[PDB]
Design a protein around this nucleic acid. Structure first.
Lengths: 217, 35, 144, 131, 129, 150
RNA sequence: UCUUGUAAUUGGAAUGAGUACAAUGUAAAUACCUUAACGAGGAACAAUUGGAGGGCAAGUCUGGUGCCAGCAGCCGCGGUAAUUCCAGCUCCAAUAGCGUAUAUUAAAGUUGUUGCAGUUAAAAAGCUCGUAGUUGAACUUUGGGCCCGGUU
RNA sequence: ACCCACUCGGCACCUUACGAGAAAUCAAAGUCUUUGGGUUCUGGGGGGAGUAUGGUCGCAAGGCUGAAACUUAAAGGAAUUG
């Protein structure tokens, strides 16, 4: 029974938008989570970490639960969710919420020649978070993912098929490696190739033309 | 102090959020006898 | 930048600087000084053989104790005296005085392992038979 | 002083020996094909890695290179004549896409079971061993 | 001092592209800098560059257009045997297709694909992608 | 920056973008040459002749009006000195500061500045004998430098 | 109504480890290849080596021994810096092989040319001059037109 | 002498992160896994140890260069919370 609460919610409620590439094309800021559930189904989830953290007060010791979760349906769309809350169910729920708020698309490609349904990443790419550098290297067909099982699970949820994964730093901290991998896959989407050198039509941000049923009530 | 060490380090992965096998009367013993 | 010379005709300084820095290793200095052939209790050997000089009643604690003893042995080729942790209990009755035991390391590539301070050898064989077979009642220790 | 007889081992144990996914996949393969141990899987993986390395450093070579043409055509001919690679997949990026059970299908044991005559894989192995 | 003017030119271009400028000023100018920028302009990585001629050594003003991730020099100029050219790419390129490593051969200053087509080799000069 | 100090100053002269005949000159091409020869016969150094020409006679620089540099002009008529100008001034400065040091023996700053000046003299003399302007050895020493300078 | 498992249930099949007429083999023999005859019903013709908090795959098992100024009172309970004191059960991995010791290589970017680090974690000479060594601004025929023929 | 504007070369200062870093913080500690402007010096877990010995300088005090045997699973730094 979700109701449209923003301009994009009213845009998706009538079903006039059918692809996420328009959101990711003109750099549309995402405000709510229900838009990606009502627009894309099959978003499978898998909890990565639940830990009890503490905050010390004058008299008490308030224990929070931190939830780290990943989201991705089957192909090139990855979101990471980090949350600290009061209860395990609430922490998991809000982590999935912020995971849907943090969905980033991925551009996959070919390690070799341009034949048969792209499998791997197009560029050598890196990511860093707190003295942990996670590197991603394209690999040939049938190589699979050679990485830590957390990174392997994240990359299998990504939809990529063959990744060579070198890593450096103190890699035992799970959160630093996960965030390094997240900023790495964001980087390899953001990288500029000559294939993006053809002159795009550069549309006129159709939120302008759809503003008369997407405005306030 | 082997059992005490295993019980003390046994609680950390609960704090750090990793699965830990539940304890019983097999913890601080020579599981496999020596030569 | 980055400290080191980088020019194309500058291989000699790289060579000599690498050689001095490699002399500030730990394995390189232990290997090229011939440290194991002159100073190690073994002669750089994987195993060795020795004469049981003494056995001492070394327990972990006082009377409520763990029976984990060691013997003191003198080598055949070097003549140096070392000490060795014997295996699991029940093997102490096998190891008597002057038994010609055969020793190996303990597991830290040349350092002591375990909660016994200063013991890095184990009695692999006694009287030229075994400890595993002798403890499992498979073979028996020959007399004298 | 007789001239030496060259030998070589034909399998390679995995680097990480205790991981659940690889162990269960290996047991899946051994159960479905009826294998004595893991050494058959290791042997197939070893020679498939050899084939894949040859295919990789031929694909790195520039196109119309005579060495690339000769060795690639020989490799594709050999893996079609064995019967692992299909008739419609005679390329190099397609021989990079080969899998272990594709090789394990073409054994005599699996082929004598699949052609009738054996009614099981373990009965097929016992039937073969007994001449 | 300016042991390499090509290094300083490439650093100026790289920082100006990182900041987002449209124009970058390069001083001093050289034959090799002009040829490096000509290879870039032919491949379309930079825009249009024009040579201000004072009597000393000149200046260059480069009209950028984005679409340049990194350009860099390799120093010292190692001699590159032909059969090792691809090895160089695998050490300083993201993929095997896009991006070019630039060589100076006795047939001129050219990217590695043209060097492979002409069957020439020489000294490594730098990379662009 | 500077060779023997920490400074990084850039004060210099900026030659204009022109190599032909300023329009207000319209005087001659050899009268300036005979002025140069007359000034050199008076007993001047090429830089002093240049500063006198540019401050009095409107010669912007002799390299464009005459077609040759001043020291080249003095070489053409046999007015060249024994040792070049900058080496001569460095040697004279070294002699003066060495006399001041031998009069006041406790001045350590003058010792340090002597070491700097002799280092500069040695580097300049090595340059001069490399291109064979000085005699091929010329062996500069402290005492005979006095008899070398005047 | 078609597909799997269990069992102190039952049935016939098949074959080599071996025992060997013979023949091949071999300088002569031993063995391999072939084969007349014999050769499987479970303690037969019986597979071992390591390990089980985490590393790392596999126990919310069982019994016994020794101590307690702790409860009970001769049944026992709990604890036991007994680093488990001793045995058994169950489970996991590799398998005619498996374990241990030493050395070396990889992981190791803890030798770093690729490819380390030097404010505070190891580490910038107290400062300057200076020989070898290492390094060193820009410029000198570019551009245009002519044909022919090579490779897709 | 002062004020206003510009410029060169200084000692510095306040804010910020396009960037960097373990962090404190940094216009350099930036332009570095997307790793190469030139060039010197130095370090490779902690004790033993700036110790022994040799060499050399100094009248001396001492300075410069400077180990190994053995031993250990730590040692250390940056912030938060009381």
């Amino acid at each position: 029974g979700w109701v449209p609460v923003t301009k994009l919610g009213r845009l998706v409620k009538a079903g006039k938008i059918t692809t996420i590439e328009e959101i990711f094309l003109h750099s549309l800021p995402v405000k709510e989570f229900q838009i990606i559930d009502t627009l894309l189904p099959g978003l499978q989830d898998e909890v990565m970490n639940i830990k009890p953290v503490q905050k010390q007060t004058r008299a008490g010791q308030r224990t929070r639960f931190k939830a780290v979760v990943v989201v991705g349906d089957s192909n090139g769309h990855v979101g990471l969710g980090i949350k600290t809350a009061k209860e395990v169910a609430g922490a998991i729920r809000a982590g999935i919420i912020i995971a849907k708020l943090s969905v980033i698309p991925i551009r996959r490609g070919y390690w070799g020649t341009n034949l048969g349904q792209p499998h791997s990443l197009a560029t050598k790419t890196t990511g860093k978070c707190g003295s942990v550098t996670v590197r991603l290297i394209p690999a040939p067909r049938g190589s699979g993912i050679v990485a830590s099982p957390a990174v392997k699970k994240l990359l299998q949820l990504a939809g990529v098929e063959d990744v060579y994964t070198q890593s450096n730093g103190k890699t035992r901290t799970l959160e630093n490696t996960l965030k390094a991998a997240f900023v790495a896959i964001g980087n390899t989407y953001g990288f500029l190739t000559p294939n993006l050198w053809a002159e795009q039509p550069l549309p006129v941000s159709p939120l302008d033309i759809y503003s008369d049923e997407a405005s306030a009530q | 102090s082997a059992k005490s060490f295993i019980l003390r380090k046994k609680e950390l992965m609960k704090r750090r959020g990793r699965k830990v096998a539940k304890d019983s009367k097999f913890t601080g013993r020579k599981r496999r006898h020596r030569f | 930048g980055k400290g080191k010379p980088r020019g194309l005709n500058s291989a000699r300084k790289l060579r000599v600087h690498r050689r001095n820095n490699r002399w500030a290793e730990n394995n390189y200095k232990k290997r090229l000084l011939g440290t194991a052939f002159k100073s190690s209790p073994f002669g750089g050997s994987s195993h060795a053989k020795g004469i049981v000089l003494e056995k001492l009643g070394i327990e972990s604690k006082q009377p409520n104790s763990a029976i984990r003893k060691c013997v003191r042995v003198q080598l055949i080729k070097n003549g140096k005296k070392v000490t060795a942790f014997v295996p699991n209990d029940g093997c102490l009755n096998f190891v008597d005085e002057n038994d010609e035991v055969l020793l190996a390391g303990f597991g830290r590539k040349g350092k002591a392992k375990g909660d016994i301070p200063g013991v890095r050898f184990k009695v692999v064989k006694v009287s030229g038979v075994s400890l595993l077979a002798l403890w499992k009642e498979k073979k028996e220790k020959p007399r004298s | 002083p007789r001239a030496p007889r060259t030998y070589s081992k034909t399998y390679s144990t995995p680097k990480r020996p205790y991981e659940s996914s690889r162990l269960d996949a290996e047991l899946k393969l051994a159960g479905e094909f009826g294998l004595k141990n893991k050494k058959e899987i290791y042997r197939i993986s070893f020679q498939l890695s050899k084939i894949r390395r040859a295919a990789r450093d031929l694909l790195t070579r520039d196109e119309k290179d005579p060495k690339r043409l000769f060795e690639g055509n020989a490799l594709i001919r050999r893996l079609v004549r064995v019967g692992v690679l299909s008739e419609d997949k005679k390329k190099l990026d397609y021989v990079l896409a080969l899998k272990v059970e594709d090789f394990l299908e073409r054994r005599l044991q699996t082929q004598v079971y699949k052609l009738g005559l054996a009614k099981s894989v373990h009965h097929a192995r016992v039937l073969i061993t007994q001449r | 001092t300016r042991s390499s003017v090509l290094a300083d030119a490439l650093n100026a271009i790289n920082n100006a592209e990182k900041t987002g400028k449209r124009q970058v000023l390069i001083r001093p100018s050289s034959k090799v800098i002009i040829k490096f920028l000509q290879v870039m302009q032919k491949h379309g990585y930079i825009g249009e560059f024009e040579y201000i001629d004072d009597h000393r050594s000149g200046k260059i003003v480069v009209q950028l257009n984005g679409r340049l991730n990194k350009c860099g020099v390799i120093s010292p100029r190692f001699n590159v045997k032909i059969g090792d050219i691809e090895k160089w790419t695998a050490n300083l390129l993201p993929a095997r297709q896009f991006g070019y490593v630039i060589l100076t051969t006795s047939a001129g200053i050219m990217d590695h694909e043209e060097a492979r087509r002409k069957h020439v080799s020489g000294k490594i000069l730098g990379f662009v992608y | 920056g500077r060779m023997h100090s920490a400074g990084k100053g850039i004060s210099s002269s900026a030659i204009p973008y022109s190599r032909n005949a300023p329009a207000w000159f319209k005087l001659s091409s050899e009268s300036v040459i005979e002025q140069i020869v007359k000034y050199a016969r008076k007993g001047l150094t090429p830089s002093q002749i240049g500063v006198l020409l540019r401050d009095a006679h409107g010669v912007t620089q002799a390299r464009v009006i005459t077609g040759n540099k001043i020291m080249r002009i003095l070489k053409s008529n046999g007015l060249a000195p024994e040792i070049p100008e900058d080496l001569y001034y460095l040697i004279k400065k070294a002699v003066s500061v060495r006399k001041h040091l031998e009069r006041n023996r406790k001045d350590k700053d003058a010792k340090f500045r002597l070491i700097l000046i002799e280092s500069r003299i040695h580097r300049l003399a090595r340059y001069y004998r490399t291109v064979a302007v000085l005699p091929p050895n010329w062996k500069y020493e402290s005492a005979t430098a006095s008899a070398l300078v005047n």
